[PDB]
Symmetry: C3
Subunit: 107 residues, 3 copies
Amino acid sequence: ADWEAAMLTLLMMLKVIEKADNAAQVLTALWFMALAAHMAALATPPKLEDKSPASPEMIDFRVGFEELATEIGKAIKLAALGKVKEAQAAAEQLKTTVNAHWQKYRS
Amino acid sequence: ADWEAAMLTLLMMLKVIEKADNAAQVLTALWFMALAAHMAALATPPKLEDKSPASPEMIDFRVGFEELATEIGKAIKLAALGKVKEAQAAAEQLKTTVNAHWQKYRS
Amino acid sequence: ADWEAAMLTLLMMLKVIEKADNAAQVLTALWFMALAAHMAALATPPKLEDKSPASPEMIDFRVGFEELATEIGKAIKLAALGKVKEAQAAAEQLKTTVNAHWQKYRS
């Protein structure tokens, strides 16, 4: 999948997590978020397809995405110990991260 | 998982997508298809375990699988924007791709 | 996700597989197990963060995890051909593998 496809997956997974009841759906959706973030890290946003791969404007993208993956792993571990709500709360903060980053590169 | 395990996953995921109603199940199953295709790309079909890794007969396999992954990403982006049916239709064309390729290397 | 997050995912996925009825939920959960095992292979258990990457005590971890991934692929192929119960039985043996390995590095 390409970059905005994966960011779209992240947004909708967030809608899945928010409306979920048990630990397993939250954890599953969080793992889908993990996969999709990983790929969009390997991908390149459309507005950025014409800047240097060693450009700071692109390398910034690389580390913001590193950040996203980190936060997702944290939330996954909270959903892992079974704290389904503290993990849903981490997902709130996560949607903050995801929205900032999608907005910066949506174009 | 090995190659035919992943092609089997693809076929059954297709059966999941066809009988699905909402956008999220289609998108989830499509992501499972993404993962499984990726791995079977890294794997090697049984009938092909004895041809050169630089063989055209094997390198053909490599690019047909590249094709499959590409089509899956497209269908994922249609299921991402919420076009659950146009994505189900892309999944139809996808089952064409998947069946051709499984048939070529099933043995 | 980090190492114990992925081992926790494996344990709970096992609880999903045991209480499942159809082939598709077993296969899906097994694929989540595949992903999570892969990552925890790339990760490093907390008690092991201070031994050589070429240490036998760490390289042992690397191959025990190789073993786990192998068994998961086998079980996935049984769940692929639709043998939902023989795959549930492989999942029994799998929980043996997973528990041994989580116990060895839990700390």
